[PDB]
Symmetry: D2
Subunit: 115 residues, 4 copies
């Protein structure tokens, strides 16, 4: 509910299906601890990463494994992955959608924060 | 069902709400005839523009009235509107989503074509 | 000099070379009159479209012929072209760079306005 | 010369000036070692980060300090920074331009790779 990831393919004009996504939370020692992960669905979406109880304020990193996605399509890509790093705050809207639009040599990302 | 428009605001990190959208279809005389229109919802989406029966193959133009959107937020914009021009074909997937991500001096658009 | 167009290819990570560009200006009768045209160089850039004297106040449309670009590379893209429509020089003369980043099913455009 | 960074502001339609950029290279022990750093000029560009001799094969991370950029302009943005991670020079030496287009809740990045 509170954190969703959506991935789109700008070459095929389609959801980016079966993309691995890893979420990390910054620890007190300034290391990235694993938090949640999954693979995007047939709709390009990854739901159920976390719960309101566990998604406390902090710095989070969403890593989208774009290189493996392009390699599986036979397309040489530029990036190792796409990383989205942000602070979650409780004074802001409650639902976070991290969206990424992928091309072999480019990506765009935006946050949609609602409620 | 066959044609949906989704608009996002990259300044606020939100759906772009109440954006006027006008759809045109190219006529035989190479003029743009009005086809469908509406305003985006609270989710930034505009549904119900057309039906499968009416959405025949042809060249379509989706005009998103970005200038009025930014002016209503007190932000000086660059573009008069964002225009998305494309051919609809029956050999391709059946549902078209035209997505646009808006900033005052920039926009990005992508097509998600599924089924 | 006062109007430059730069086009990049997000699939190859390269300038988009030999892209046709047509510029129009809205006339008093609300028709798009031809204003200037050209093709991008090896650097993806198109210079020398107009002069300070000729580039008067008005509403301009920069049409970037993306479909022909992709088709020549063996890709059947979504868009017919990318159109950038804006009011120019209404505060006085300015220098405009219209940049476009192209993918088969997506494009992004931004303006850099100086002076 | 072999590595350049260019940053644009999609809110103002201008180069993003005085943006801090830190480059890291992955070491044999899989740690990110500092490689180069600098700030964008009035043109939004950062030149002279490295040399052909020093810019050997490896995995590099270009960290663009977008949060500090927006905060200085009175905007509380979403991202901590924009990170661009890529393998460089594995086919031989190349010239890399990392471009980023910034909005408060979104960024786009592309690579132009030549030679
Ligand atoms: C980064 C980016 C994202 C999008 C989209 N987000 C969403 C989010 C939810 C549903 C459809 C879409 S489509 C569209 C254009 C760009 N550039
Ligand atoms: C990431 C991105 C970058 C650009 C631009 N790169 C350059 C590089 C050199 C000169 C002008 C421009 S403009 C345009 C659109 C997007 N989305």
């Amino acid at each position: 509910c509170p954190l969703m990831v959506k991935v789109l393919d700008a070459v095929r004009g389609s959801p980016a299906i079966n993309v691995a996504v890893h979420v990390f939370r910054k620890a007190a020692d300034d290391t990235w601890e694993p938090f949640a992960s999954g693979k995007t669905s047939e709709s390009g979406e990854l739901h159920g990463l976390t719960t309101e109880e566990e998604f406390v304020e902090g710095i989070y990193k969403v890593e989208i494994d774009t290189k493996s996605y392009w390699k599986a399509l036979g397309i040489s890509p530029f990036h190792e992955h796409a990383e989205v790093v942000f602070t979650a705050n409780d004074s802001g809207p409650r639902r976070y959608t991290i969206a990424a639009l992928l091309s072999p040599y480019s990506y765009s990302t935006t946050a949609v924060v609602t409620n």
